[PDB]
Paper text:
To investigate the effect of (S)-lysine binding to the structure of At-[name], we performed crystal soaks with lysine, and compared the structures of the lysine bound and unbound forms. Electron density showed that (S)-lysine is bound in the same allosteric pocket previously observed for Ns-DHDPS and Ec-DHDPS. The carboxyl group of (S)-lysine is coordinated by Tyr130 and Asn143, while the α-amino group contacts the main chain oxygen of Gln112, and Glu147 and Asn143 of the opposing subunit. An overlay of the (S)-lysine bound and unbound structures showed a surprisingly low difference between the structures, with Cα RMSDs of only 0.29 Å and 0.30 for the superposition of the tight-dimers (i.e. the crystallographic asymmetrical unit) and the authentic tetramers, respectively. Indeed, the changes observed in the lysine bound crystal structure compared to the unliganded structure are confined to residues of the lysine binding pocket itself. The side chain of Trp116 undergoes a shift in rotamer upon lysine binding, closing down against the side chain of the bound lysine in a gate like action. Small rearrangements of the Glu147, His119, Ile120 and Arg146 side chains to accommodate the lysine molecule were also observed. Given the similarity of the unliganded and lysine bound crystal structures, it is possible that lysine binding significantly alters the dynamics of At-[name], resulting in allosteric inhibition.
The first reaction specific to the DAP pathway is the condensation of (S)-ASA and pyruvate into HTPA by dihydrodipicolinate synthase (DHDPS), followed by the formation of THDP by dihydrodipicolinate reductase (DHDPR). The structure of the tobacco enzyme shows that plant DHDPS is a homotetramer, made up of a dimer of tight dimers. The active site is located at the centre of a (β/α)8-barrel in each monomer, with the lysine binding site located in a cleft at the tight-dimer interface.
Author numbering:
A (entry chain A), B (entry chain B), C (entry chain A), D (entry chain B): 59 to 365
Amino acid sequence: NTDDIKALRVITAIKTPYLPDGRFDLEAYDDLVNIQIQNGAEGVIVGGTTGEGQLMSWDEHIMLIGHTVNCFGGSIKVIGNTGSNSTREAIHATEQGFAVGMHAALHINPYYGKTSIEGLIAHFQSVLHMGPTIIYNVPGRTGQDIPPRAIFKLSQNPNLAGVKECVGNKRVEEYTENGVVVWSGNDDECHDSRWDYGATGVISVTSNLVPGLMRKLMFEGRNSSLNSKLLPLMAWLFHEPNPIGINTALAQLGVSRPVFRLPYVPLPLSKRLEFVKLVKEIGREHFVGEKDVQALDDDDFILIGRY
Amino acid sequence: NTDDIKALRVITAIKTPYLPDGRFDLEAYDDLVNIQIQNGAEGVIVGGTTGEGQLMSWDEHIMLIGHTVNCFGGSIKVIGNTGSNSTREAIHATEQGFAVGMHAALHINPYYGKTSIEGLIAHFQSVLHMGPTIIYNVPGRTGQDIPPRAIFKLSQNPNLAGVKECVGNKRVEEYTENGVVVWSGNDDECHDSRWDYGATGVISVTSNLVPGLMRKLMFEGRNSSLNSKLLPLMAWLFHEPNPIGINTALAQLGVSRPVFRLPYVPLPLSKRLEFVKLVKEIGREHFVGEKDVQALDDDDFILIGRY
Amino acid sequence: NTDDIKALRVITAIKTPYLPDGRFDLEAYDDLVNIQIQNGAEGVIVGGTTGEGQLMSWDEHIMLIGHTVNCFGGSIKVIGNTGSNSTREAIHATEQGFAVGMHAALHINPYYGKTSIEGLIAHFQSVLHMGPTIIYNVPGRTGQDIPPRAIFKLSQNPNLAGVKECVGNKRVEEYTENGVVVWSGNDDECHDSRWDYGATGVISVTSNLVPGLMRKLMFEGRNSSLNSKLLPLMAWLFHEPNPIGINTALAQLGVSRPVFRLPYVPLPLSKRLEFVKLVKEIGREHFVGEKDVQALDDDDFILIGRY
Amino acid sequence: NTDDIKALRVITAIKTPYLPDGRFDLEAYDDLVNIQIQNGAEGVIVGGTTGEGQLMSWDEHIMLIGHTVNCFGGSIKVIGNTGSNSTREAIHATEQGFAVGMHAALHINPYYGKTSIEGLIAHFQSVLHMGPTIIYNVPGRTGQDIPPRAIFKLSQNPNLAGVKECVGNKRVEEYTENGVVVWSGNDDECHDSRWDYGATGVISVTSNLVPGLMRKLMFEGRNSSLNSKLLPLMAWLFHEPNPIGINTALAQLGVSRPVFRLPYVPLPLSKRLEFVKLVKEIGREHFVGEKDVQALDDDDFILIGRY
Ligand SMILES: N[C@@H](CCCC[NH3+])C(=O)O
Ligand SMILES: N[C@@H](CCCC[NH3+])C(=O)O
Ligand SMILES: N[C@@H](CCCC[NH3+])C(=O)O
Ligand SMILES: N[C@@H](CCCC[NH3+])C(=O)O
Ligand code: NA
Ligand code: NA
Ligand code: NA
Ligand code: NA
Ligand code: NA
Ligand code: NA
Ligand code: NA
Ligand code: NA
Ligand code: NA
Ligand code: NA
């Protein structure tokens, strides 16, 4: 049902944690999803950008979606990231994700092998009939800005739930004034996006760390002092490209093992020490996990290319 | 041997033609490669952006490399596009591409899931030991400009042959002043890149149509009137994102079937009528194949999602 | 939980039905599983021999397991056939099947590339720790009889639920006298296996057609007149190798489309006419579906090699 | 060309050696192939039963074929084992194997999911049009004896080169009396098959160890004393199912690493000490490689499941 996707305000693009040889750590993963549920997260993107969907083989990506649905699907909406720059891969991944019971699909436009606007419509029309879909526009990553006129055309399909928008609040505004549901994809804009530009909520990286605070920010009104308390954390999280920050942070909080699939590599020690300061400034009680935050040594990290 | 790669001036990023069910049309592909050889192309990229490597599965990609090596490897350099945004997939694809006998690899930086400069170094160092490599910088497609300082760090690796650069002639000049071999990735700049800015040559889209003229442009001295006669054809080929133009043109020339793997769709008839006029203005004798060029109807083109 | 697998008496190796181009027909499949549930089937093997697991790619096999768990897993035990002649494929398929929530795994011994008894133990020990497992011995198909001493050793693992045994009642007896749970894999022996040789029940092909009668046979005592009423049907079902009969029968009853993935091909018209007679002799009210049984013409069947 | 296949008398089903992580050891593989060439082997089967095609993924299988073609295809016939119990996989694998340049295909009848004789015809006819083919009958592994009448139906297809027959010399004689080319698949029968029953030659396991002697056995006339000197080595190689023996022997000769992909495990030390004694009795100068033969300890062998 599309309405139940359009109602969600806090959707976590959840991190995918790894065992020391690079396989998925399902125990760590299930603990992360439980913590999100317990703090009032309402949806999860499985294998999004933050979840390193880009480094999974399809078999592990589908498995992670079916696993999430099977263990948690009665307590949180499960949105599979089954988009691709290849229409073939997007069709197969999407019908398989819905077949295993996911509630919605996140679809990016084709990245790297960008196409024409007419190719864009054709790509999205190949999958939009399969179930509730969120379209993801992030031109800083894909190389291509999905134009509003393509979204207005696609939003004729009742399966289109809305758009995860990264271009900025002026774009959010153009959609929401025209009746298209939008989730901000920029944590550091999502407060204003919510309260001033009609965004329904956020598809967040930062809620991997402080889900209770992100939920407060999306449900309890303007609170620019809470927003600006979170801004240093968000800036830290994006000092290098996502998910490098979140991968480093979750290892420091002891909820994830310090294992990276290449090409990502941890933030250096000076940044890690900054994170230890942010956690003390904001308060450890707001962060996921129970263990004391650690700086970690460089020697603690495992980088794997053959996963 | 890296020196043999360094010496190529004309490398064609060859188009991959399809059968109406979406599979590779190997007979048409062989004809295209033969045609390149008879016109003096010195290298092909197999499954590059132009060859839609992005739409292939790894098994069909490695197969096309091994097929290209087995049929043509004594007459042209075969450069497999075995890069990936995933280090795991880049390591596997590169190992297998070298095992079936390709002479070099083309490696892009990770697109879409972009990484830090440190991660980029880890990524390239995971494959550079395998054999002669060209690094590919096209930030308009990947979302990330590879900084010269990263290349300079890698360039003393004896396997780094040089860089396929799309940023422009000022970046070309910075690399060649610093002693890095550069191929221009922009057909509409490669003349000047070659004669004014020290590029060794071009990795070309336009040579799929006019290989003899592109060879002339890279070997015979500055020729600004040849260059400006090709410029309108070059603009036509990039009207929509490559390979939309080349896929359309080759179908009109009758050397490939009018079959598109999604998300690409053809140029519309008004552009296809311009292409007919360009062939006549430049001379059909310079274009690949021998069939009379056709305009084609929109209903000639088969758009396939489930390949 | 292993006990809940050991309790099941009627497990249907369910047929996998296809669309006209060879993809899975999930609508037809869901109707078959619903009919099994409604007639008191207690488990299903997903992608067994009968379900043509051997012709699926892994992605579709895992998908079918996760689909079955998600739609039906609260009303019937879902047993994935995640065995393989390759230990690698068996490990991956099995952990993925359990991750998507299947209740048990069916594991055959390595077929075609048969191994030593010591290789057999090693193969099974690679997967037995993952969850409740039924080991499948069918030497007429694999080329190798799993010996009782390998099963006695493996049955030290609390995850071993029991054995699907095809060698015959004397083998069933040897296991059941020693405390190992057995399901007969031979429909035409399963009555005697149940009542005289201690089998817990049957993993049945014939219950795809007459699930209510197979359930009666397994729960309601010796009834050799019911058994011998079913024998002509069972003999028909195995006139050619399974699943050729069941695929032809379900198409005749109108619950499946008449589409075969090669190398299977339908029974000829004279056999189909015999099936029409068996259905009238036993009574259409005992067979799955509501449509009148049809002979079908040869022209109605679709055989597909490129699925 | 089919006539060139028909003329080969000594074809080695080459072993695939592994690195300790489970990947192919291509350097050792090249040495083994070179050694076959220097001793007069005329064809190799790549990824046959002996080469563990059954444990490979299709991409590594097609890669090994293309690698074998690219490095050795001018000096030996390369016959890809591209058969499968799945017609879909046999069609794809065969197309790709021919595309990377193999000279012929080896096709087994569908094993485990066995089909009717009509289905078997449909299966073989789906791949026979692709190029020169040897059909492989080994009912002790597949569960199904291909009947001569099926081969006779297919043998007027100009692509059928002939049959690799494991049933025995009486079946060999029936085929050769009927004008079908036959290679013996049983090392311990191939002498008599060759000199008494009209076989053209052998597709051999034992030539992985003693290629020069096996060539002698097939080319130089009846030699019953050479034959009976090889018989004890041949018995040793089939003590457990092939390729357990050959994998053990090559490791002891030091031409491959002591690495096994599961489900195969090595022969125990008492057999490995017999192999040392056989090398000495026959003469090390006849065996592949030049390292002194070693017994090896059980703890030398790496058994890998997650390759
Ligand atoms: N690396 C590829 C494959 C990912 C497949 C699983 N999501 C991509 O980013 O498109
Ligand atoms: N569509 C994926 C996979 C391509 C794999 C073959 N080159 C990508 O662009 O990364
Ligand atoms: N045809 C192969 C692959 C099947 C994979 C899905 N069960 C086999 O029978 O082993
Ligand atoms: N294990 C499967 C797949 C092998 C695929 C590569 N030859 C089989 O024996 O059919
Ligand atoms: Na608002
Ligand atoms: Na807390
Ligand atoms: Na906490
Ligand atoms: Na010409
Ligand atoms: Na021409
Ligand atoms: Na009993
Ligand atoms: Na009924
Ligand atoms: Na019924
Ligand atoms: Na020697
Ligand atoms: Na030797």
